Amino acid sequence: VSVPVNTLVVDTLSPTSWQASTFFVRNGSNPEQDPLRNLSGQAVTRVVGGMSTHWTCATPRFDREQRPLLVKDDADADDAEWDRL
Amino acid sequence: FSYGAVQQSIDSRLIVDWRFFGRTEPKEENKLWFSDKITDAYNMPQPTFDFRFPAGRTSKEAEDMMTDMCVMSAKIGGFLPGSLP
Amino acid sequence: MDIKYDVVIVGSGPIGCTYARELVGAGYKVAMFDIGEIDSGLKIGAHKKNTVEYQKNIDKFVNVIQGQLMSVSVPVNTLVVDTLSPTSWQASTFFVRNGSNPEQDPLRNLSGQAVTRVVGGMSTHWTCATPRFDREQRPLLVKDDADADDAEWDRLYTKAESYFQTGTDQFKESIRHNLVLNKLAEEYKGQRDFQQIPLAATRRSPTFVEWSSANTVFDLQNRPNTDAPEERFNLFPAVACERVVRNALNSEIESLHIHDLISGDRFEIKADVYVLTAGAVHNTQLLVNSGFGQLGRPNPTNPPELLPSLGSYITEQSLVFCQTVMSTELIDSVKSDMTIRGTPGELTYSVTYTPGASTNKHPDWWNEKVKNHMMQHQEDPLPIPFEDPEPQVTTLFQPSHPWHTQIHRDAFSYGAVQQSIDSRLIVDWRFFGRTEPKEENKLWFSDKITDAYNMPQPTFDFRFPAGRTSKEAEDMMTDMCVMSAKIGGFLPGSLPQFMKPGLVLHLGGTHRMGFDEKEDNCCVNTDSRVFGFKNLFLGGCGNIPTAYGANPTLTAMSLAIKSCEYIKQNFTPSPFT
Amino acid sequence: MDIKYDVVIVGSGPIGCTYARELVGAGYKVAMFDIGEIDSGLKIGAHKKNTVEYQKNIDKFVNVIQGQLMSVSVPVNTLVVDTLSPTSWQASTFFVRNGSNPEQDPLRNLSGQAVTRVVGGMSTHWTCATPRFDREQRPLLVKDDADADDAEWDRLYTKAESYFQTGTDQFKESIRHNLVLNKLAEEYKGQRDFQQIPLAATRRSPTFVEWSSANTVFDLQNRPNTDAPEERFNLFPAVACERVVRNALNSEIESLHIHDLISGDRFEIKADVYVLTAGAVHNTQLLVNSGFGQLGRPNPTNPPELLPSLGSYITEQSLVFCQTVMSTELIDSVKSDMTIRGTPGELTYSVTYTPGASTNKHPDWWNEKVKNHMMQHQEDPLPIPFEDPEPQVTTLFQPSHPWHTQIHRDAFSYGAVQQSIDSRLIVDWRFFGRTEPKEENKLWFSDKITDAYNMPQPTFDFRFPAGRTSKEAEDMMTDMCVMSAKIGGFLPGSLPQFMKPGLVLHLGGTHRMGFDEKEDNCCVNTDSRVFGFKNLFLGGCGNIPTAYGANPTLTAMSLAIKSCEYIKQNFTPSPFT
């Protein structure tokens, strides 16, 4: 999703090879991205069916502690709604 | 996922994967934003993250979760070299 | 070189030097031989880490260690390299190459086992951790009286600690030491105690520690000299000791065969007393080469008649390792007493504390160090001073946690590239397991293959025993994972792992001690005297017959002292002449 | 320690020892200081590879080398480690960590540049290759007469070769040496010559070579002693030399400031003559710290008035490296004179040759070695004896191939795991380029940042110059690829590559020599005397002002001899008292 500017030093190039004076924006890096405040592993999938064409298929339910409320002031009604859905 | 590029020397029937998944507190400071100048490969505003795992419960739980995987996995077998916690 | 001495000692490690310290001081005419050479500077056998340069570049000492660890038994290499050019000569089989030992089953090895051949032995590079063994880890010196046994060990360990200059105070003003030790102390709810690792070392300044070594125990200078005009001692480096000559009755040693590696010549040396302190592996090799035990691949059909337990019941410790990166919680606690205002590097930034405030969590000395660092180095985001000494923490082996622990910074496993993570954040974790002695676990020597010194090639037949030893090793791994978590998360590239078997270099039981040769399946008695022999003694960790997790050298030293007392009681030094 | 000497020498490397050998022998009262300590055994400053153990375990010496190469300038680390636990303290920026130099542009560095602080300097670990420079690589000692210039260099190199014990015969009976050298000799069609690398070394036996070092040049023992009762010399290890004190006119040095690293105390030493031989980097540092050149980041707006060329025109060699695995063709040629019948290990197997047969391609000595190996070791598939010495081959720099070459086995780049490929098959290739001196290429020192000895932090501003130097480096890579192919294919994991800039450790021109300070953009004249100063001399590769590919030490030594001749011509030793 967002790849920061690469800062690896490669100093074993031949002297004839063209060589950067700075760590410039290369190879699809996002110059807006702080590499230390990223989700570097975040990725997206553009194919019909999306990520469900490759996913692990684990489909647990959320218990109350993890789950948004669908009914505000009635935990039993909220449970019933989530159970049905 | 994480089969990697060379053949396991350890018999596959012995190997078990452990993945523990933490919950993250929603915090206003944690953002997904889009550049007003940089675009992605589809000429759309470039996604940029400003993200850190929140410092309190979320971080404490993540580390307790790591420990929990270490304790639980030990009941089944030792770690596979190259796939350490 | 004379042809006759009162006492000959094979090996100039810290255990060989224990015998020299005791016996040279008692007026014996002593010769000492080492296959290795004088390395460490003009202080013979001294710690190589004791240069100003290494202590300013501590990341480099790992290389010194690796450069003198020569693998004991390397199996035939079976890696397939099929990307050679078609013109390159290529093997049709996995043949014996590059010093591999064809006797070695690669799956029953201690692949990490290594030896060090330099004057001072492994004490020229060691970590200097010298804990005592509690009863559960320790051989008996007195059979049926635990109080008397305790008294004996207390007396011997106390003297050994004096020889090594063991202390527990050298790191007391380290912020990083404190941070780790205090946190662990408060979390174990009174049920485990944390203290400084006992270290054979003397601090010389805030940034220099004189680590102890063989040289500390005995300075290894030839005598008579000006400082000791009535002592008699000669050290002969680059001399391979190859065989001791038994009489027919196996009741006396009559000679030691030596090989001068410089001239190439071979000689035989006569002594009243022969002391072998060549290390756990090489003591055993020298004895098998002398007709003790059995040369060649073991067989039950035909077990050896002389010292049948030699090279059996060997023990090595399981060792687990990781590194951590200090928690935000701990880093923040360093500066908990500070009032911090503004942003570092800006005109209005300040860091202050109130000296003596009862609400302060740290004493003035700490807060001074921290304030000054934070104000003088606003480019630096950490509150820990740059030259803060390393942590040196342990919780010692107990029944409820039967492993030794070191929570510290070791010169080893720095590796070849610079840490991107700040060093002040990094802490090493090494937990050390105890291994049950089992007859099937062996160190044996080939009757055909020889090592680089033309001596019978050492070969291991070793597996960690299946029951208690294995269960404890895995519980020990878990314990390191749980405990380390209280300090910080794992450092990527140093995740929790078992180290290569034997890399720990704590091998014992190869020539083990007991009261009765047959009943205790052993090789030397509690005077370290080889059973049946009047004048042959063995020193070193090879004597330790028990399952121990703590570092063995101090215990081996203590046994050596007891052995020297026997020698003093039974052999008369020659007239000074 | 006295406060007054005839001659003070800073640094106990082979160049410092050249000055000591010359000047101590000529009757001067000499003091020598080294920031490093006595390491190498009782032979002070001797080669660390000269132990019996290292020559039986040559794969281990790489660690000794790495353990004393301390990086000169390490840039701020920018590796992103984002797999830390959320509890671990984590940087918001790439701040100065772990001894990084914030002055250093990581893209204009010699990241491989390193220094060695031990008595004997880098000659305690070096490869010992001592070729002469041909005219094209060599500074002029005589301006307008090439024959006179040749004569001068011949005389100086001949003496330098005597000091180092340089020879070209120590490997002549190596089958592997022969195999490589013979093949290359026959393939270059008379247009390039191959010979043994000239090596500062004396063979002691078929399996031991005494490599030369500083100690070979001067044994470094304090004098007067029994072997030299009328000489005067003192060596002071663990003494950081920090500044020389100029007079106002910059025409004399009046004192040397020293720091005893053991006591911590600082002192000043007076001499008639001051010789700086602290290495190419550290000579320059000591001079900048003394007010020569310019401290701080260079600026053209304000160029230095004292020795403006100091730290400019620096040169380092491009270095390309690979290893090869010997061709089937070459391995087969080893045994070309043998009649081979049956299968190894079977009853009918035999390997025979006809001694003296004119059709034989090898002499009897070779065929004997090969037959006996093949018959005695039928488990082994190679015809090369196990203890066959390594290849040591070169074709020296020439106009048509303007690089030095070493085709050999170096103690370096053995790395941390055992070769699966048989060692007898492996050959190292190192080709060394010459670098044009350019004003923009600098070694400078921070006015704010200090190194571990509290001295101004060295910082490089270096790129290989774009034209001839770069074109040649790439042609040199190609030349190694073409030439190596005649011997074998590349060894996987050692493919052809440029080494990290400066890892070659052949830095020159930091305090360069010439005839005229202004016209030749230089710092010392042909007596190695600093321009304007009566009594300050510089020694080492920092003096070499030319683009050179061959290893510089012998040339630096030769210059040092010429410098000592000037000292002998102009300074009177003090009365022996």
Ligand SMILES: *Cc1cc2c(cc1C)nc1c(=O)[nH]c(=O)nc-1n2C[C@H](O)[C@H](O)[C@H](O)COP(=O)(O)OP(=O)(O)OC[C@H]1O[C@@H](n2cnc3c(N)ncnc32)[C@H](O)[C@@H]1O
């Ligand atoms: C990659 C992956 C994901 C995964 C997983 C294992 C892997 C290897 N395991 C999972 C599991 O065990 N249990 C589970 O609940 N989730 C697991 N996942 C994640 C899961 O696949 C996703 O949560 C799920 O697929 C999300 O579904 P959703 O329908 O919301 O989104 P999608 O699959 O990413 O599909 C979106 C589609 O939209 C198209 N797209 C994107 N942008 C545009 C625009 N601008 N215009 C038109 N179309 C667009 C994408 O092409 C994609 O197909």
Ligand SMILES: *Cc1cc2c(cc1C)nc1c(=O)[nH]c(=O)nc-1n2C[C@H](O)[C@H](O)[C@H](O)COP(=O)(O)OP(=O)(O)OC[C@H]1O[C@@H](n2cnc3c(N)ncnc32)[C@H](O)[C@@H]1O
């Ligand atoms: C390498 C190492 C070891 C070590 C350690 C860290 C490292 C990196 N940390 C330790 C620690 O913190 N606490 C501790 O108790 N031990 C630690 N060690 C292990 C320790 O160094 C050894 O236990 C200790 O040195 C053993 O002493 P010992 O005197 O018994 O043996 P040695 O040091 O190996 O010396 C033996 C000498 O004998 C010579 N030799 C070998 N064979 C021969 C023959 N055939 N002839 C003549 N001489 C011989 C060797 O050259 C050696 O010098």
Ligand SMILES: *Cc1cc2c(cc1C)nc1c(=O)[nH]c(=O)nc-1n2C[C@H](O)[C@H](O)[C@H](O)COP(=O)(O)OP(=O)(O)OC[C@H]1O[C@@H](n2cnc3c(N)ncnc32)[C@H](O)[C@@H]1O
């Ligand atoms: C590391 C290395 C070097 C090397 C080589 C292989 C390796 C692994 N192979 C070589 C080869 O085959 N042929 C050759 O010509 N050179 C090779 N080298 C390089 C060679 O070792 C050096 O060129 C040579 O040693 C340079 O000699 P020099 O005497 O000029 O300098 P030194 O050896 O670096 O010694 C300097 C001493 O000075 C002390 N010092 C440094 N600073 C101070 C201060 N401030 N005060 C007091 N003393 C100081 C150092 O401690 C060092 O001992």
